[PDB]
Design a protein around this ligand. Structure first.
Ligand SMILES: CCCCCCCCO[C@@H]1O[C@H](CO)[C@@H](O)[C@H](O)[C@H]1O
Ligand SMILES: CCCCCCCCO[C@@H]1O[C@H](CO)[C@@H](O)[C@H](O)[C@H]1O
Ligand SMILES: CCCCCCCCO[C@@H]1O[C@H](CO)[C@@H](O)[C@H](O)[C@H]1O
Ligand SMILES: CCCCCCCCO[C@@H]1O[C@H](CO)[C@@H](O)[C@H](O)[C@H]1O
Ligand SMILES: CCCCCCCCO[C@@H]1O[C@H](CO)[C@@H](O)[C@H](O)[C@H]1O
Ligand SMILES: CCCCCCCCO[C@@H]1O[C@H](CO)[C@@H](O)[C@H](O)[C@H]1O
Ligand SMILES: CCCCCCCCO[C@@H]1O[C@H](CO)[C@@H](O)[C@H](O)[C@H]1O
Ligand SMILES: CCCCCCCCO[C@@H]1O[C@H](CO)[C@@H](O)[C@H](O)[C@H]1O
Ligand SMILES: CCCCCCCCO[C@@H]1O[C@H](CO)[C@@H](O)[C@H](O)[C@H]1O
Ligand SMILES: CCCCCCCCO[C@@H]1O[C@H](CO)[C@@H](O)[C@H](O)[C@H]1O
Ligand SMILES: CCCCCCCCO[C@@H]1O[C@H](CO)[C@@H](O)[C@H](O)[C@H]1O
Ligand SMILES: CCCCCCCCO[C@@H]1O[C@H](CO)[C@@H](O)[C@H](O)[C@H]1O
Lengths: 254, 254, 254, 254
């Protein structure tokens, strides 16, 4: 039932944000030792678990860019596109709230200790706990290209890993492999834009940080062009290219 | 036979405490370099091995919260609930003793070198080798919510990973995936309460540290409200919610 | 179709260079925390994904040394040897360009900040982002022996992991295991020559760095004997030994 | 054929020493960043590959303690016990020589730079590249207990992971899981005695270091009681206990 699938998409998306935002909070306000690889593998494995939990019900999109691409290139029912997307964004938002609630005290003590004013340009770093912001050395267009390229890779490899007509079927290994895929993308490209690749994963938590005291910088990242636009459209404009490229360059040759 | 299952639960629970408490001892008194992720993945993989060793005999609960939840939502024989729980706690206690016995000299030389009085409030850090204690910035109720939420997630995902009617069956991959699940929980939430999620895993070693010279602080953690209560009830009150949530939100939609 | 296989070899080789060169760029110009193991596992998993993507089409050589060895010991069609090799080198070259394009600004700001003249002997370190260079303490012949030994091991274990007549078939696990194989080679021998083991993986990006401003040092590494020769021939002269050794010492005993 | 099995045991044992001793050399003389977990996982995965390579031919013992235990509790042909053990020790010795040959220059430059006299008590640290030595805070008997306990665990879990009558068969996952088992043992107990658990893995390289200039300390570790005895007998006296415990406590209940 659609209602059951929307619930799964809500829970699955919330689950990966819980693990994801959770580990970044540990790094930022709990002093945990996490390198780029550790942060990336935790996000990836977190995603794998979310897939294992919801694949049997909704098919585990847990990503608006993936839903839209599967609609355009996988015959996914267009009537379920918006219901899935609203569920994904709602789950991400709620999970972000839950993580903030559990780490609550550490956020305030860190801001107090380091004299950080939440909502200021300097608080964007802590806001990074919830969503993505661009590397200091790159601009809007450059950040957009990054998200576009990595999401295309994400979509393309998701199709390849789940395409049973491509080599030996992965079976139950598929979700795990998708998690490791996210891990290598995060390790190789993460320093540039925080490998968002998912509109729900970014906007939901951004809206929460906005409500929790970070204000407008949660959306702009302290940049002239409001940054939230990149994690919103770059992934969509990227998953479509990825899906297209797979069928034309790999599938059409299987 | 029940006697055979209690032996397996004793060994399995002891095995994961051996690996778990062992790596934390290495970190604390042997100067090993371990970040939050490393500590978490070792605990998780340690649990996976314990499952591989005992699943075929007892079903590998190795956790009182899991036993009680499987009794309430999986038709697990109620007559085996207490026998399993006593075996789990006894195994955890013994393994803790074994690890202390192997690292014995390093404990005393570390305390001597750093002028630490075992049993004092400052020795709670070393006591952390055996069991869990709350992050300095959070209190009793906050720590209780953490354990409740993560154990619910643990139970829920354990059911999802072992539910063959949910997507493609994991088969022999299940235990490993459960280990990785524990790893991501430990990495994302571990800095808050040491992701106990298991009454036997915490109480058994706490009782040992109590007997080995840490005294009352082993139970209180140096807090007004005796901390041991959290790792004792939070997990139980959490595994039940998790089990419930799975059947109602995911299973009922498969 | 051969055209379809050359496209897959181009994409697959480009994919592993993207992830590989990407993570090294993060380490060198983005300040990411990556140890030898992290760098090695990312390269390995990156290779695994490239295999999953192309195995079903071309068989996933993604390495000139592997193509030549499979031709000499696996009846691989000799008419496809050169088409595969040109595709592999072209894909590696293009991916290197793409990674440089995404990290563009970080390269210049790093060189500016650390007063590094691109093209100078001191810029060889940054050039290391794209390809391999020898450890300061070893010379040409020593570096050649390293690449020869590790590629022989690579080829031999690739055959063993994919040989269904050897123990229990790995099935869909094969690519992942090959990735982990590369990871352990990189961790144990990587500090010596950057575990190139693949002519396309090294020459393509070297030619790019040459064109992007590093000049002649991209090829020589600042050594009397032009270093590029080692990653070019050592792997070939090594994959053949490895393939030979497998059939004679292991296969002939199955 | 026995000759073919002895060759596989020689190669397999040599392979894991190559990866193992290789990564420790990187850490000690090549300045690579490796924590206890990284070193442990590399050794483990290295062992997994050695198993994948030789399991189909010899059954992949690659360890005298395992051969002897399988003879006493698995009906392994006693006529092949000594031939296997000589092959294991010879392979370990040769691999150690090969690793030293590839890292040759780094050893001398490190000793020169840090004014270390090879053969002196202070050179035992570098000798640690090849084999195991006890933690400064523990003595002979304590080190013996460690090796005994961990090898018993090793043997017992190897039997459990390969016992198809125990839960869902692992199939091709078995070797990998055994590698991860070694990884968690190394992470939790490695700081105490270098988790030798294998007479061939320790004696062979010790004999090499002895011949390569470390002299008598290679065998004694600079201790009154010659240390080499522990990695020699502790594992044997431990694998037997482990094998026994498995059949009596787990197998007899399947
Ligand atoms: C299983 C799903 C449970 C969802 C619980 C959501 C709990 C939200 O948590 C709450 O969020 C508030 C706003 O950020 C904070 O101010 C509170 O301190 C916090 O407890
Ligand atoms: C599940 C629904 C959660 C809704 C968002 C609640 C966020 C509460 O968060 C609070 O917001 C206040 C106003 O910004 C801030 O001043 C506080 O510091 C912050 O704790
Ligand atoms: C699913 C995502 C839909 C996003 C629709 C656009 C939401 C824009 O949101 C708006 O962004 C501005 C940024 O400066 C702010 O000034 C506004 O307060 C904020 O509400
Ligand atoms: C296979 C299971 C073996 C269980 C052996 C338990 C060994 C306990 O070990 C002992 O514990 C004592 C109390 O902590 C210490 O004082 C001793 O030094 C130590 O050797
Ligand atoms: C397997 C059964 C083990 C029972 C617990 C034995 C713990 C012994 O441990 C010892 O306890 C003494 C009293 O606290 C302390 O003074 C010592 O420092 C400590 O080594
Ligand atoms: C399976 C777990 C059952 C636990 C039952 C409660 C055990 C309480 O244990 C008690 O805790 C107090 C804490 O300050 C101490 O003062 C006591 O000495 C100690 O025995
Ligand atoms: C899906 C495959 C897309 C291939 C795109 C290749 C893009 C190359 O990228 C370009 O490379 C130039 C030379 O290094 C740089 O100067 C540019 O700044 C960069 O954008
Ligand atoms: C996909 C085809 C890419 C072809 C290579 C383009 C490399 C452009 O790279 C540019 O090269 C210039 C000349 O070396 C340098 O001076 C610049 O600093 C560099 O950005
Ligand atoms: C598939 C790989 C084929 C490689 C063929 C040899 C290419 C050599 O390339 C040459 O190397 C010299 C190094 O100093 C340079 O001086 C030249 O400018 C460069 O073009
Ligand atoms: C595939 C198996 C190849 C085995 C090759 C063994 C090579 C030994 O290597 C040699 O060892 C000597 C003694 O340590 C050193 O002095 C030499 O420098 C080194 O090259
Ligand atoms: C494969 C057979 C290898 C046999 C062992 C050769 C070890 C050579 O190693 C050499 O040994 C000399 C004597 O100790 C030392 O003085 C040198 O420093 C050392 O390089
Ligand atoms: C398979 C392993 C068999 C080992 C048999 C015992 C080998 C002992 O070896 C001996 O050890 C002594 C240690 O101080 C040295 O003095 C000798 O030079 C050395 O040859």
């Amino acid at each position: 039932t659609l209602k059951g699938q929307c619930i799964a998409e809500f829970l699955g998306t919330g689950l990966l944000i819980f693990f994801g935002v959770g580990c970044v909070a540990a790094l930022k306000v709990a002093g945990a030792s996490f390198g780029q690889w550790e942060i990336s593998v935790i996000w990836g494995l977190g995603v794998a678990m979310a897939i294992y939990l919801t694949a049997g019900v909704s098919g585990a999109h847990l990503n608006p860019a993936v839903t839209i691409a599967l609609w355009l290139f996988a015959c996914f029912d267009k009537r379920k596109v918006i219901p899935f997307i609203v569920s994904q964004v709602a789950g991400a938002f709620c999970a972000a709230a839950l993580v903030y609630g559990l780490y609550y005290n550490l956020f305030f003590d860190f801001e107090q200790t380091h004299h950080i004013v939440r909502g200021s340009v300097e608080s964007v770093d802590l806001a990074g706990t919830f969503s993505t912001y661009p590397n200091p050395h790159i601009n809007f267009v450059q950040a957009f290209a990054v998200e576009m390229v990595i999401t295309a890779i994400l979509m393309g490899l998701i199709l390849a890993l789940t395409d049973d007509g491509n080599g030996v079927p992965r079976g139950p290994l598929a979700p795990l492999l998708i998690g490791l895929l996210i891990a290598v993308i995060g390790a190789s490209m993460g320093p540039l834009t925080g490998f968002a690749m998912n509109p729900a994963r970014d906007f939901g938590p951004k809206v929460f940080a906005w409500l929790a005291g970070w204000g407008n910088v949660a959306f702009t990242g302290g940049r002239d062009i409001p940054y939230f636009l990149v994690p919103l459209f770059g992934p969509i404009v990227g998953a479509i290219v990825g899906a297209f490229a797979y069928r034309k360059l790999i599938g059409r040759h299987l």
